[PDB]
Structures are given as C-alpha cells and as structure tokens.
Design a protein around this ligand. Structure first.
Ligand SMILES: [Mn+2]
Ligand SMILES: [Mn+2]
Lengths: 200, 197
C-alpha cells in the first residue's frame, strides 16, 4: 500500500536549475508509475507489504523470484525518487556544515574534491542510473548504480543521490548531462543530507 | 578512423513521427560523441569495421574493452538505425520477408505486438531488435549500447529506446513513440538485410 509522496515545494520552485515541466512529469508520471507497479507486485504478500520501501529493497534475496525483478525495478524506483525529492530545495545550495562537512573533508580532502569526484561518477554512468554518496561500514564513499538499483541492496546507506536517467534532464539540458550535474549543486539541501548522515 | 555517416534524408523528413530537433541532436551530438570516443579508445582494431569490432570484444584489450563496447556499440547501432528509417517508409513488409514474419509470428500485427512489448519492456536504456539467429527470426532487446552482433546474431530491424530518442516529443509516452515508429520503417531495407543474413 505504498503511496506517491507530495513534494516539499512547488513544481516550479527549482527553476531554472530544474524546469517545471520536468518536475511535473518526473513526479506525476515516472515516480507514480513505479508506485503503481510496486503495489501490484507485492499485492497479496502481506509480509513484504508491511515493510517500508527501503527495508524491502534492502533484502531482495527475501523476495520471491517470480516478482523479484518487479520489486527491484519498481521498489528501487520508489525508494530512489522518494529520497531524491527530499534532497532538493529552492533555498538549498552552498556547502555542508557540522560533522558531515568534517567527514567530507577528511575522506575526500575538501568539498570541492568531493564535488569533482561525485560529478565524475554521475557523468561516467553509461546508460540510465544514479550517482550516490553513501555510508558504507560507517565510512563515506561515492558510488553509482544502473537503472533503479539501490545501494541499500548492498548494505550501503545513501545520504545523497543524483538521478542521471535522461528523463531527469533532457527537456532542459538535452545531451548536456555535465551542465545538469553542475546545476544540481544549486538545489541540494545539505541540511537534509546532514540529517540522513547522522541517522546513517 | 571512424567517421559519422550522413543521414539519407533531411533532419525534418520524419516529422511528425520524429521531430527535427531530436533528429538533429541525436545525430550531431549523441552519435557524433560515440564516434569521437570510439576513435580515442582505438592499432589493428582500426582497420576492422565497427561491426566486426563489436562482433568480438573478447579480442579487444581489456583496458579499453568497455570504451569499445559502449562507443563501438553506439556507433554500430546508430549507423544501422538511420538506414532503417525513411520519409517514404511505413506500410507493411512484403515478399519473402513478409512470408517469414507471418510464419514465425503468425501475422504482421502479431509481430508488431511482440516487438512493441519488447521495446516497452526494456527497463532503462537500450534497444529492441528483430534478428536472424542461425537463420531464424527472433525478437530481442539489449541494454545500453549492447549489440546482438556480440552474440552471433544479425540485426535486421532495431528501435532505439534510450529516452533521448523520444523525450522531446513524447516525454514519458514511450508506447506512443513505438507506435509512431511503424510509420517510418523502411521495409525494403529490412528485407534486403534479411536476404543477406
Ligand atoms: Mn527519475
Ligand atoms: Mn540513440
């Protein structure tokens, strides 16, 4: 009984970094489709349905082989986008602070180095996928996954993610993925990332 | 070594099925990029056609295999794709090709349903294909720029389902794009490829 979450802001609140039309289609069509298909996949499996989408994707091995693909793709779609909306803000941007900033400077050397490495991962993901900042064994690291696969399935907790499926940027940037990635930094809600960091 | 092929028609020749903006960007940016990157990756491999190159990545240095796989596949796939479209295309298959399709799939309509299902079912980026395997017609789909050629199969018809191929005009509506695709397919070219394979 999963549901499509409402956005924390207006559809045009992230302009011009992300266009109103993309936000509208991305949320009401793409994300919504993952929710619809996810509910159809777990229909009848009270056990799986009672778990949060994150818990569900965290253990795909416990999902029946007959619907494992559907849960992987659609569960991943729902988990990834639900997190993604909460990481954006019309009042975001800037740089991390507190414990998160300290960890970033210690692991990557500096926030600028982190952005360079994160941008490289996002640009290097061939095909559809996501670029991530996760906590693995209590350590921060950058990774990328294909399609709707989530780091949660490998025991890693994402605290920042960038959707690099073409639907996330084609209307305003077309083939210019690097320009989309650069614009991303202007809307990142580092306060939310910091909260997820503490929880991870 | 490798170069970007010219389109057999104008950028707006496939309208309204495929918009001129998409054709222009798809060819001059996406395809051109695959060519540029392929050339960077590639001594002896240079003398091999892109088709033969992708036909056996196993014989390619593991230090550049991924580059050749993605960019070589990109070049080979798009090179073929452009030749399968035409402003005078569409209609329905004929001759021996039509006979084989009706025999294997039951009818052209059934073939279209199966092809569209494969194309709509490809999760993420990829391609839907009609290939000749061991002399038999089969419908398959590959991820990203992977090609049936790498599996010993010969593609005679292919549909690009990467979102860049249809997002400007169809956005999330991939099924409407697949439907419009039938109006521009060059069946004489598919038939020619089938006869040689
Ligand atoms: Mn998305
Ligand atoms: Mn393409």
């Amino acid at each position: 009984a999963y549901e499509l979450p409402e956005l924390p802001y207006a559809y045009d609140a992230l302009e011009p970094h992300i266009d109103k039309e993309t936000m509208t289609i991305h949320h009401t069509k793409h994300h919504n489709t993952y929710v619809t298909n996810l509910n159809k996949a777990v229909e009848g499996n009270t056990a799986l349905a009672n778990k949060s989408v994150e818990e569900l994707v965290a253990d795909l091995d416990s999902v029946p082989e007959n619907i494992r693909t559907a849960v992987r793709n659609n569960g991943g779609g729902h988990a990834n986008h639900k997190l993604f909306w909460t990481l954006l803000s019309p009042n975001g941007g800037g740089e991390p602070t507190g414990a998160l900033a300290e960890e970033i400077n210690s692991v990557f050397g500096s926030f600028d180095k982190f952005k360079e490495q994160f941008a490289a991962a996002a640009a290097g993901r061939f095909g559809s996928g996501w670029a991530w900042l996760v906590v693995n064994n209590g350590k921060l690291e950058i990774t990328s996954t294909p399609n709707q696969d989530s780091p949660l399935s490998e025991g890693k907790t994402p605290i920042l993610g960038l959707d690099v499926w073409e639907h996330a940027y084609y209307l305003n940037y077309q083939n210019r993925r690097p320009d989309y990635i650069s614009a991303f930094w202007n809307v990142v809600n580092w306060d939310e990332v910091a909260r997820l960091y503490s929880e991870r």
